[PDB]
């Protein structure tokens, strides 16, 4: 399979829901196949510039390993979910597990 790094920005008003969505995403990944090598919650960070007239957001960082169908499903879920205002997906070589900076 392939290793991906995913960054999610969540509307602060819906921060109470973040746990449910991350559990269901991890559950989907696991039932299909693959691993989760990092899960980090940076918290409620202020944005450098407003997005959709919002000034703060919840930041989630995932380092996972999964397949193409799982990647497509995750992209579709991020697109169609409204709690997610921005997402970044980056291919990686080798799995990163060490606690990143910006964790605090």
């Amino acid at each position: 399979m392939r290793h991906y790094e995913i960054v999610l920005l969540v509307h602060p008003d819906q921060s109470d829901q973040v746990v449910g969505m991350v559990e269901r995403y991890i559950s989907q990944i696991k039932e299909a196949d693959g691993q989760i090598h990092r899960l980090e919650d940076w918290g409620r960070r202020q944005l450098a510039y407003p997005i959709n007239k919002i000034h703060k957001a919840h930041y989630i960082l995932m380092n996972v390993e999964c397949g193409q169908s799982t990647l497509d499903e995750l992209e579709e879920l991020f697109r169609y979910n409204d709690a997610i205002i921005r997402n970044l997906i980056i291919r990686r070589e080798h799995a990163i597990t060490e606690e990143s900076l910006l964790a605090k």
Binding site: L9, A48, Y49, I51, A57, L88, I90, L101
Partner: protein
């Protein structure tokens, strides 16, 4: 470089937010390319501003 390394990224950014050329900071070309890519990814991620 990595885009989460925000303080190090700010070390190479002017007060307008523009990227500093390699000639001024003495950077290597390979390191500079990675630094610029990290800056652009951070700008998209909204950890650092695009302008100002």
């Amino acid at each position: 470089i990595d885009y989460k390394d925000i303080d190090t990224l700010k070390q190479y950014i002017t007060e307008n937010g523009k990227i500093v050329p390699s000639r001024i900071t003495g950077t290597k070309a390979r390191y500079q390319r990675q630094l610029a890519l990290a800056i652009k990814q951070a700008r998209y991620l909204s950890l650092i501003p695009y302008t100002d």
